[PDB]
Structure 1
């Protein structure tokens, strides 16, 4: 375990594959950093997974690296207002205001962190067939 002060005098690696030097030219995938400023790096730590830097509401966003920061913030703020199944004993509880979805469905593009958030078991949404088009101008 390391805190904010101990992280100042340590060298952490993003992925374990970066611990060893490789030997590409793919116009579809991302480009890894060159890191040609230092001759030889002496890594002392290694991150378990980068996707763990996010929180609870941010882990639900599918592929957050392909979005914008304001959009991600808006999604993380709106995720706390989605209708779904908050608890399994809603029939015996007398809350002031409760909203329960009819047919809760799990998303197709899920993340591994959801496996620890009980999202695939208690979802808050539906997989609807969406089309991107300009019909009779009633969707502008």
Structure 2
């Protein structure tokens, strides 16, 4: 375990693959940084997985590394307002307000962190078939 103060004095590799130098030109995939200011790096630690920097709410977003940053903030707010099934014992609790979606579905695009949030077991939404189109102008 390291806290914020000890983190100041260590050198962290981002993934296990960065611990060793390599031998690409695939025009679709992303460029990895060159890292040519220091000739040889002496790593002391390695991240377990970099996606764990996100919290509970942002972990529901598929592909957050492809979004403009305010959209991840906006979804992190709206995700807490989405009807699903908040507990399995809703019939015996008498809460002031409760909402249960009729037919929850688990999402077709999931993340690994959702296994532990139980999102596939208590999902909060449905897979709609969506066309992105201008149709009658009633969707401007």
What is the distance in 2 between the residues matched to 1:9 and 1:48?
Answer: 19
Give the alignment's TM-score, normalised by structure 2.
1.00
Q: Secondary structure at the match of 1:131?
A: strand
Deviation (angstroms), 1:80: 0.2
Task: Name structure 1 gaps, 5 residues minimum.
Answer: none
Q: CA RMSD in A?
A: 0.3
Task: Name structure 2 gaps, 5 residues minimum.
Answer: none
What is the distance in 2 between the residues matched to 1:75 and 1:37?
Answer: 37
Deviation (angstroms), 1:16: 0.4
What residue is the counterpart of 2:20 in the other structure? 20
What is the distance in 1 between the residues matched to 2:131 and 2:76?
Answer: 24
1:43-72 deviation digits (Å, cap 9, x = unpaired):
000000000000000000000000011110
What is the distance in 1 between the residues matched to 2:108 and 2:13?
Answer: 31
1:76-97 deviation digits (Å, cap 9, x = unpaired):
0000000000000000000000
